[PDB]
RNA sequence: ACCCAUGUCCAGGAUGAAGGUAAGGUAAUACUUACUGGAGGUCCGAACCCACGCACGUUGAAAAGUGCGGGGAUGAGGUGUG
RNA sequence: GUAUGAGUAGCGAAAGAAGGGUGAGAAUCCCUUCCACCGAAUAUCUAAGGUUUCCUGAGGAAGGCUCGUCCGCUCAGGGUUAGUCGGGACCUAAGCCGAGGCCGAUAGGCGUAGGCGAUGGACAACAGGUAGAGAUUCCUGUACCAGUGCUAAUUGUUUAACCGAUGGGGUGACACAGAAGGAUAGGGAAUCGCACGAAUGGAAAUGUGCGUCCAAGCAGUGAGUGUGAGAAGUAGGCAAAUCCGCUUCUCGCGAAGCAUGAGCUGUGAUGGGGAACGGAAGUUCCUGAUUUCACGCUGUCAAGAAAAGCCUCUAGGAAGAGUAGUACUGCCCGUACCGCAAACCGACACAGGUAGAUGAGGAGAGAAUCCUAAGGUGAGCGAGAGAACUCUCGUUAAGGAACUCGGCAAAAUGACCCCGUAACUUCGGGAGAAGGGGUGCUCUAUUAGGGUGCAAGCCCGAGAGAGCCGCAGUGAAUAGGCCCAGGCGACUGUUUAGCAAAAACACAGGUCUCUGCAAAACCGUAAGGUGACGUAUAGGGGCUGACGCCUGCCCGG
């Protein structure tokens, strides 16, 4: 089998906004993506 | 805010086919509730409402060349009235 | 008693078990059950700190009074029960109050007997007294290091201490290890050994049964790689190519005493095992 | 990979451990024969899991597979969700 | 950017044919008929995931490995209806966050209360119709849960009808295996009805085909399975208790009563569905579940979630209370479609992978296997020559391992029954050892005998004879090659995902060693944790590696 086995819950609870904003080093990711100007933050 | 809850009727062949059974397909605010829609219709047309149904629709993806975007998110209520009441016309 | 299994296949070729005569019921006390959840040597952090643990049959914690705070009240012994959470067995006790508790089963404790606690309790298997009020020579278990904390020291199966004297505020106790120790005299203990004396004699007989008991495989260091163990490596079977055998963290394994050299318990310890 | 909690899956057949009952047998035990019983990291064997051999593929149907055979298959089992 | 190879390799596992039709144009689209494929699936549901791919009408630029008049493609319009389904407003598990707090150069780490969090627990609706697209949603009928008001009766007022926790207690609340039963889904016979009654020698019936129904709910019943009953008194259940728990007496048990309880009978039904728009028959019997009773019973050891919800108990609150019938009320999200697949994961319309419920018949132990049913498909390049070589297959004179690193591969064995079965043995095994024989059909045969049943009838089918035919009778497919000797490792198991399955790892067992509990050891700066909710018959580390007989000398380093 293969390595992407999707799940919305897993996706969001790992890589999602609240998981980023829970963590000091995930708010930098968002600061850094807003600094490049990405249409999508997480 | 009845006139704000009830945005539009849904004029289509399905809807017209269904009007003869005293059922009316309205497009409504996506934050409305079934019960709000009931009392709003009863206000605005002086009918009696027996039952109110409701579905939510995602937006469809459309194109015009280089440019994609989803049509607006829709909420479609299907009111039905007590048989011993007066009709909404269209 | 012990039950040899006939060698009907090589998993049973030398399996032995218990026949479980001492046990009368198989329905524990729901009001005294609590849950347990396997940790598999994992930690606060999630890291495997203590190896060789994980993945057995699940268990419930049976709440066991080691303190014996219920003084003077008589308790009828109702039943003796298996506890997976210990080698010993546990005896259920209905007090005349209506309270129900469990205790360690002592050797010879029978269903139907009556149990007491406190200074007015005769020296009889099941009764718990302060070492202040226990005569020399008697055999005890479930000793506590501190009053009111609970019995803490001899609790396992077939296990017994023996009183040797007094030192005023203290009392000398030969624990099961041969260690004579000074323990306070306001510290309680039970009279008697422990019921499951046969426990040590059981041949598990099968790899799976240690798994069921919750015990993962032990891998030796002489097989590991040098990154993984100081006995690792060598282009074959290699001996312990070091001054001493070694744990996976240095720190010699054989003979090396790991007790702290400046411990507060030193002078309460009268004779090391 | 290891683990945690919670679930779920394993067609069908075979063998016949302890124990128990009865007859025989004894001063009484032994002990024998039958029947019952249903144990097992038990057997055979699909699903499921694995991957022993060979061939083919080898700018592949596929960045590790296909076909013919092969091992385990109530357990140290397989798998799902988190 | 364009060449070269080069009009080359390839066009991605498989059965199509013809006739009609549409159309500018047809191997490729639509229809029909024959044919073929899957069928414990190549069917039917449905999670997760994808997110409009669904339907309709136009279209053929590009995409589709060809083609295209078609599409999961492009445009444009439409389509997803819930008090009862599933998730929330109900509960909690692992885990996560975490007021305060404890730690810590900062940042932050841990963590109590508390709160989130299903893969689990609780919880009330069933059957039909639905011709473009949804259905326990809509519609038709019949109901259920919770609440509200309106009527009509009844009752209560402070020694208080009633409600009753934010607290207490019982249940909830549970493993694994085994066996036997009851019932039912299902399957199949006659029976009943409807149609046919026949092409090619024969048959007007021992003829052929098709079908031979219906819930939830309400009332009643019930294979049965569990369970002893009352009275007193209470050192206990953060306070309280009329409840639980404990104790003591009385009456004792294939007898009731109380809980559950599959299913069954009548209603529901003067309805619906259904083979000829209408509407026939709907009985009897056999087999029989992997479903349900039901983790109910029995046994075992490895000793098998919590909380809510339910019932009760008081603490309390109490002037309004419940009964019947009425009519009304009942929120949010999802609901299309795919869902062993061309729509998910794989860059592809990829021979890969993808959880669970159902999953029929003959023969059969069987979800094996062969053929098939319902139902789905005919796999997105073709036709035609039938040459070397390559691949997958099939058969081969005589010999039969001479091949070869090596019997690699292939061939052979193969199923049920019967006879019989060695050395050795840890007395269980070896052992399906080996080696051999028999299997078909017909009559004795509604069989000897069994199962079922009130009987009629309906299934299973034991030997035996007497015969018949073939080269051959598990006539197909599916289904062990065996033996002797030896080394290694006892064993089952694990291992280098993607060159090594092993004599390597583990294993039970042995032994040494450490450790007195704020154990030792480990993670971490510390707090905090594992260890362990354990306590030397326990825990950590090292070595050895079942079992048997044994394990010797040396302490100078
Ligand atoms: K769920
Ligand atoms: K079949
Ligand atoms: Mg809805
Ligand atoms: Mg260990
Ligand atoms: Mg190595
Ligand atoms: Mg090193
Ligand atoms: Mg070394
Ligand atoms: Mg060497
Ligand atoms: Mg050397
Ligand atoms: Mg086995
Ligand atoms: Mg085998
Ligand atoms: Mg294979
Ligand atoms: Mg097998
Ligand atoms: Mg699978
Ligand atoms: Mg996972
Ligand atoms: Mg060329
Ligand atoms: Mg070619
Ligand atoms: Mg098959
Ligand atoms: Mg379509
Ligand atoms: Mg094309
Ligand atoms: Mg929640
Ligand atoms: Mg549909
Ligand atoms: Mg659907
Ligand atoms: Mg093709
Ligand atoms: Mg030949
Ligand atoms: Mg020949
Ligand atoms: Mg040769
Ligand atoms: Mg040669
Ligand atoms: Mg071979
Ligand atoms: Mg081995
Ligand atoms: Mg490999
Ligand atoms: Mg290999
Ligand atoms: Mg060992
Ligand atoms: Mg500490
Ligand atoms: Mg070794």
Numbering used by the authors:
A (entry chain 7): 2 to 43
B (entry chain W): 2 to 91
C (entry chain G): 2 to 274
Authors' text:
One class of such proteins are the antibiotic resistance (ARE) ATP-binding cassette (ABC) proteins of the F-subtype (ARE-ABCFs), which are widely distributed throughout Gram-positive bacteria and bind the ribosome to alleviate translational inhibition from antibiotics that target the large ribosomal subunit. Here, we present single-particle cryo-EM structures of ARE-ABCF-ribosome complexes from three Gram-positive pathogens: Enterococcus faecalis LsaA, Staphylococcus haemolyticus VgaALC and Listeria monocytogenes VgaL. In each instance, the globular NBDs of the ARE-ABCF were bound in the E-site, and the α-helical interdomain linker, consisting of two α-helices (α1 and α2) and the ARD loop, extended towards the PTC. Our structures and mutagenesis experiments support an indirect mechanism of ARE-ABCF action, in which a conformational selection in the PTC, elicited by ARE binding to the ribosome, leads to antibiotic egress, and hint at a rationalization for the specificity of LsaA, VgaALC and VgaL for PLSA antibiotics.
Additionally, a lincomycin-resistance ABCF that belongs to this group, termed Lmo0919, has been reported in Listeria monocytogenes. L. monocytogenes is a foodborne pathogen that poses a particular risk to pregnant women and immunocompromised patients. We have used our high-resolution maps to present a model of the ribosome from the Gram-positive pathogen L. monocytogenes and update the model of the S. aureus ribosome. For the LsaA and VgaL samples, occupancy of the factor on the ribosome was high, with >95% and ~70% of picked ribosomal particles containing LsaA and VgaL, respectively. VgaALC and VgaL, both of which belong to the ARE1 subfamily—although not LsaA, which belongs to the ARE3 subfamily—contain a short C-terminal extension (CTE) predicted to form two α-helices. Density for this region, which emanates from NBD2 and was located between ribosomal proteins uS7 and uS11, was present in the VgaALC-70S and VgaL-70S maps and was essentially consistent with the position of the VmlR CTE, although was not sufficiently resolved to create a model for this region. Although bound close to the mRNA exit channel, the CTEs of VgaALC and VgaL did not contact the Shine-Dalgarno–anti-Shine-Dalgarno helix of the initiation complexes, indicating they are not critical for substrate recognition in these ARE-ABCFs. For VgaL, the closest residue to the PLSA-binding site was Ala216, which had no predicted overlap with tiamulin, virginiamycin M or lincomycin. VgaL therefore confers resistance to lincomycin, virginiamycin M and tiamulin without directly overlapping the binding sites of these antibiotics. In VgaALC, VgaL, and MsrE, A2602 is instead positioned within the ARD loop, interacting with multiple residues from the ARE.
